[PDB]
Symmetry: C3
Subunit: 152 residues, 3 copies
Amino acid sequence: KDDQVFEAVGTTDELSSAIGFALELVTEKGHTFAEELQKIQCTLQDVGSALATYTTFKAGPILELEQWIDKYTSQLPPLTAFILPSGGKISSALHFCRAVCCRAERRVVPLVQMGETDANVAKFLNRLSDYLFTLARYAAMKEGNQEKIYMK
Amino acid sequence: KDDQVFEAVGTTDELSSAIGFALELVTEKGHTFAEELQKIQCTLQDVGSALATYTTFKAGPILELEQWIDKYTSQLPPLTAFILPSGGKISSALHFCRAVCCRAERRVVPLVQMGETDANVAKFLNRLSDYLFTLARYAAMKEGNQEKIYMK
Amino acid sequence: KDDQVFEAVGTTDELSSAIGFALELVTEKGHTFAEELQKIQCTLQDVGSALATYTTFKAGPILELEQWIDKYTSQLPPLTAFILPSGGKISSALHFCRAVCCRAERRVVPLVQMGETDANVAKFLNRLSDYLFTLARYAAMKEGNQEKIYMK
Ligand code: B12
Ligand code: B12
Ligand code: B12
Ligand SMILES: C[C@H]1O[C@@H](n2cnc3c(N)ncnc32)[C@H](O)[C@@H]1O
Ligand SMILES: C[C@H]1O[C@@H](n2cnc3c(N)ncnc32)[C@H](O)[C@@H]1O
Ligand SMILES: C[C@H]1O[C@@H](n2cnc3c(N)ncnc32)[C@H](O)[C@@H]1O
Ligand SMILES: [K+]
Ligand SMILES: [K+]
């Protein structure tokens, strides 16, 4: 069980660090959501502390992510298909963050199952992966980059 | 077995997203193989669908990768030694993609062993890791960056 | 046991490749520690060879990392708190490298436990994660970027 905790906190750290690099690309251009990614890094620090102690993890950050998801989704065109992860430098970095966030979620789920950590931790990471997907699309749109949809 | 499928599709996604970021660095310079990386992202979407359904996975993309590997290898100097992963921004990003692709292959192999997915999926990822290695060397060469070989 | 070796050598490779990309960002600016990261890539090649053969792994590189850690730590302000992984492009890329290095260490530890590889390999990766943390802080400081500390 302690192996699983080290894996979970390590991959949360890998996620926060990948977001840190994406944040650098954002502040360099004229994007205003850098502060949202920085706030997420603070919550990921609290996630790491919660995994390592089970402990309480409030649902406040989950509802905040849901609010941001709604805000960006309502500015995007309809989408009912997978997109190629691309869309510009910021968008592609956010899709990498998104995939790492899904990997962190996979490491947290067993801990939730064994009752070792709050289920809200896994739900936060689940919403974060949707936030990162939506934010990538938003950045690509704001940069005038076309959303690429493969079907065959 | 369902844990293994989520791990395999997640790491395929992580691979396609890392390639998306490398693709951004490519289109920014005067490199012409951006369309090859984009085609690979489409096949990786088909890989994800095949892992998630076992299902048929044609060998067409494998032979196409083998053709591209031959095309680039025949323009490179001889190499019988490990290189330091570097060679410029594009080349170093492709070596990271290459390592992630090997990790995706490690997640797919157990599914092939249990008969749960087509062996052609693992062979595609195996050839992709050779393609990404060769493409990194090619990008480094086209940029005039020296191939670094450590021996001691 | 052979699955574990492939996982360990693959994640060492992923680490060296991530360092290669960080190295590209370093040489682009006026930072002088590019040669230290390149030397680390050479040792990581030797780590891969040691994991794959158990085999001897000298402690020379460990003491060299400890010397470099001391050199940079003695130029930094005191820190008794977690920082948000950021600090500029180079610093944030090094924090990602740091997290990947911790993941490589997690893959090496079981091999050390089963007596299959030298414990010095795990200690090298442990010191490398401290080196990458310290180097990130140093790069951020040299760039005039403020160290971000979240508490709440
Ligand atoms: C396996 C799977 C994945 C895998 C592999 C996907 C792939 N490359 O094939 C991975 C982990 C990579 C993945 C990622 C995502 N997924 Co997914 N995935 C699935 C799944 C389970 C099967 C997909 C499949 O194999 N389809 C077979 C192929 C041949 O179908 P297709 O012709 O491409 O048609 C698909 C699309 O039209 C898709 N679709 C329909 N509406 C929408 C809307 C959006 C925004 C997207 C992206 C897709 C989508 O549904 C069809 C049927 O699968 C479906 C649920 C299901 N059982 O169908 C969810 C599903 C398509 N995924 C979903 C989501 C949310 C996503 C992500 C945005 C998650 C995230 N935050 O990272 C990403 C998007 C990735 C991208 N580049 O666009 C949703 C989409 C609807 C929605 N918005 O609620 C679904 C329907 C699951 C659900 N929530 O109910 N997914
Ligand atoms: C463990 C291993 C790895 C590990 C660790 C490697 C390391 N850092 O030590 C990892 C997973 C990182 C790795 C990666 C790769 N590997 Co490898 N690896 C091996 C292996 C199994 C042992 C290597 C070893 O420990 N040698 C001990 C050290 C001390 O030997 P050395 O003095 O450095 O001499 C080696 C090189 O000269 C090498 N070599 C000979 N010809 C060539 C050609 C090329 C292009 C390269 C890169 C190396 C190479 O062979 C010698 C003996 O190992 C060998 C097969 C074997 N049993 O020897 C394959 C081998 C060297 N790998 C091979 C390949 C293809 C690669 C990759 C290109 C795979 C990919 N697409 O990612 C990368 C290259 C990475 C890089 N930066 O250059 C091939 C090279 C020949 C070829 N082209 O067919 C081999 C021979 C396997 C095979 N296919 O038969 N590998
Ligand atoms: C779980 C854990 C992690 C997890 C999650 C951390 C998190 N986000 O909560 C992960 C794997 C991400 C992590 C990473 C690191 N960790 Co850690 N970690 C721990 C641990 C075991 C518990 C942390 C915790 O949950 N605290 C609960 C929260 C609420 O406490 P807090 O109010 O934030 O107060 C903490 C800080 O003040 C911290 N602290 C005190 N002095 C210093 C100095 C430094 C440089 C740092 C970064 C922190 C630090 O100690 C307090 C108590 O934990 C502690 C040891 C312990 N049992 O306390 C080590 C510890 C804090 N980690 C330590 C280190 C070295 C690090 C890394 C630099 C390792 C590396 N090279 O990557 C990184 C720093 C990451 C960053 N962004 O700053 C050291 C710090 C002291 C030192 N320099 O020796 C400790 C004390 C372990 C030890 N070596 O004895 N860590
Ligand atoms: C969109 C699809 O992605 C798969 N899915 C959901 N969460 C994860 C995760 N953390 N890692 C990988 N795959 C995941 C499910 O199959 C879902 O339906
Ligand atoms: C080049 C060497 O890399 C190792 N190898 C082959 N495929 C993978 C993979 N997916 N992940 C990690 N290591 C791998 C084998 O030992 C091979 O000989
Ligand atoms: C700083 C904290 O990080 C955790 N820790 C130590 N090494 C690793 C690793 N390789 N991967 C993940 N977490 C690790 C321990 O709990 C330590 O106290
Ligand atoms: K992993
Ligand atoms: K960049």
